[PDB]
Design a protein around this ligand. Structure first.
Ligand code: HEC
Ligand code: ZNH
Lengths: 108, 294
C-alpha cells in the first residue's frame, strides 16, 4: 500500500517502551490509561467495549487501517482533536512502519 | 459625578436573520482563506481580536469595552500588546464594505463568536447594538495584560473586568487555539496540536505534559515541552495557584462543563459596560455552516 512494512521485531521494542504504559494488546486484556488494542484494525474509532472515551474519539468515526494510523501516530492530538491520549507522536516514518507491522499481526 | 452609561441601540430595522447572514458571511471567508499562518486559519486571530477589544474595559469608570469599536482609531491599533491583530482587521474589512450598516464593535465581537462556533466550540449567545463612538474616547494603551507575571497578578488584573476564578480559567482555555508569535509579542510556540479546532486541550496539556522553563530568541522566559508545545508564565500560573488548579482539573475531565462556562464568560467579557435596553432583543444563538447545509 502507501505505507510499506518494517521489521515486526523493531516494532515490538517500540511498543514496549512508547505505548505499553497506557495500552494493552492481547484478547480481552485489561483497559489501562488507554484501551485494549485487540482487534483495532478494521474497527471504528472509539469502540473498545467497556472504555469511557471522549466524544472526540467517538464522533471522529474512522475505520482503522494501516494508512490512517500512520496519519494518527505522527501527531495524534492533531488527527483527533480533544483526545486524552497524552502523546506527541512518532516523527520518523521508518519507526512508524516498524510499529504498525507489529500491531497488525498482534491484534488479529 | 458618574461613569459613562452606554445605551445600546439596534441598527435601523434589522433582526436575527440579517445578523445570521453576517455570521454566515464571515464564516465562509473563514473557510476559504485557510492558508493563513501555516494552515491554522483566520479563526484564532478573530477571537484574540474579540478579546483585545473587550479587555480594554475598566469597571470603575466604564472606559474601554466593546461598544464604540475603537480599534479602527490609530491609538489602539498600534499598541505593543495589540500587535498582530492587523490581519484580523484586514480579514474583516471586506465584510465591512458588504455591510456598511454594521457597527465596528458589533463586528469585532461577532468576529470572535463566529470563530469559536465554526471551530466546533460552544454556541456562544450574542447581543447586538455596539454603536460607534468618536476618536476622543479611544483608550490610552497598556490596558491589556502582560504575560511575564504570575498567579496573584492574573487574579487582580481580571478583577477589573469583573471575572472570578471560575470565569478566568474558562476564558484562558481559548489558548487551545492558535499560537504565540515572536514577531508580535516576543514569545514562540503553540499551546497545543489542534490549533484550528476549539477543545479542552489547553487543560489536558497544562497537566499531562512535563514542562521545563526556557529562554527564547526574544530573550523572554516561557514554559516549553518536548512535544513542541508551550505555555506563558500566566498560562502556567493556572496550575501553580492551588484554587486555579482545581478548575483546570475539572475542565480537563469534563469538556461540556468548559463549553458551558466559556460561553457564559466569553459573552460577558464581550458585553462588559454596555447597558442593554429593556425593550431590546433577546440574545441570538446563530446556527453554524455544518447545520445550515452549506
Ligand atoms: C498514555 C498516556 C498513552 C500513550 C503513551 C499512548 N496512548 Fe493511545 N490512547 C490513550 C488514551 C487515554 C486513549 C483514549 C483517547 C480518547 O478517549 O480520546 C488512547 C487511544 C488510542 C487509540 C484509539 C482507540 C480506538 O480506536 O478506539 C489508538 C489506536 C491508540 N491510542 C494507539 C496508540 C499507540 C499505537 C501508541 C503507542 C506508540 C499509543 N497509543 C500511546 C493513551 C495513550
Ligand atoms: C492572562 C491573560 C492573557 C494573556 C497574558 C494573553 C496573552 C496572549 C499572548 C502573549 C498571545 C500571543 C500573541 C502573539 O501573536 O504572539 C495571545 C494569543 C491569543 N490569545 Zn491569549 N492572553 C490572555 C487571555 C486570553 C483570553 C481571555 C482569550 C480569549 C477569550 C485569549 C485568546 C487568545 C487567542 C485565541 C490567541 C491566539 C492568536 C493567534 O494564534 O492568532 N487570550 N494571548
Amino acid at each position: 500500500t502507501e505505507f510499506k512494512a518494517g521489521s515486526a521485531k523493531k516494532g515490538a521494542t517500540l511498543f514496549k517502551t512508547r505505548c505499553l504504559q497506557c495500552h494493552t494488546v492481547e484478547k480481552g486484556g485489561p483497559h489501562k490509561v488507554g484501551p485494549n488494542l485487540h482487534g483495532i484494525f478494521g474497527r471504528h474509532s472509539g469502540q473498545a467495549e467497556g472504555y469511557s472515551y471522549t466524544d472526540a474519539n467517538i464522533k471522529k468515526n474512522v475505520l482503522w487501517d494501516e494508512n490512517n494510523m500512520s496519519e494518527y501516530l505522527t501527531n495524534p492530538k492533531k488527527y483527533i482533536p480533544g483526545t486524552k491520549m497524552a502523546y506527541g507522536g512518532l516523527k520518523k516514518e521508518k519507526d512508524r512502519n516498524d510499529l504498525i507491522t507489529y500491531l497488525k499481526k498482534a491484534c488479529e | 459625578t458618574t461613569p459613562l452609561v452606554h445605551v445600546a441601540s439596534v441598527e435601523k430595522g434589522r433582526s436575527y436573520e440579517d445578523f445570521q447572514k453576517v455570521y454566515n458571511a464571515i464564516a465562509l471567508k473563514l473557510r476559504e482563506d485557510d492558508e493563513y499562518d501555516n494552515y491554522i486559519g483566520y479563526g484564532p486571530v478573530l477571537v484574540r481580536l474579540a478579546w483585545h477589544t473587550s479587555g480594554t474595559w475598566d469597571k470603575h469608570d466604564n472606559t474601554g469595552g466593546s461598544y464604540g469599536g475603537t480599534y479602527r482609531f490609530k491609538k489602539e491599533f498600534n499598541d505593543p500588546s495589540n500587535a498582530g491583530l492587523q490581519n484580523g482587521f484586514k480579514f474583516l474589512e471586506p465584510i465591512h464594505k458588504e455591510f456598511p450598516w454594521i457597527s465596528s464593535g458589533d463586528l469585532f465581537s461577532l468576529g470572535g463568536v463566529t470563530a469559536v462556533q465554526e471551530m466546533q466550540g460552544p454556541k456562544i449567545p450574542w447581543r447586538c447594538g455596539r454603536v460607534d463612538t468618536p476618536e476622543d474616547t479611544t483608550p490610552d494603551n497598556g490596558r491589556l495584560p502582560d504575560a511575564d507575571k504570575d498567579a496573584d497578578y492574573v487574579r487582580t488584573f481580571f478583577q477589573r473586568l469583573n471575572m472570578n476564578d471560575r470565569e478566568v480559567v474558562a476564558l484562558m482555555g481559548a489558548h487551545a487555539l492558535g499560537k504565540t508569535h515572536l514577531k508580535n509579542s516576543g514569545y514562540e510556540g503553540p499551546w497545543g496540536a489542534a490549533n484550528n479546532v476549539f477543545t479542552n486541550e489547553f487543560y489536558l496539556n497544562l497537566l499531562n505534559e512535563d514542562w521545563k522553563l526556557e529562554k527564547n530568541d526574544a530573550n523572554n522566559e516561557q514554559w516549553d515541552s518536548k512535544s513542541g508545545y508551550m505555555m506563558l508564565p500566566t498560562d502556567y500560573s493556572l496550575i501553580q495557584d492551588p484554587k486555579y488548579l482545581s478548575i483546570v482539573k475539572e475542565y480537563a475531565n469534563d469538556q461540556d462543563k468548559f463549553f458551558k462556562d466559556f460561553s457564559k464568560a466569553f459573552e460577558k467579557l464581550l458585553e462588559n459596560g454596555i447597558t442593554f435596553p429593556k425593550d431590546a432583543p433577546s440574545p441570538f444563538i446563530f446556527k453554524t455552516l455544518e447545520e445550515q447545509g452549506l
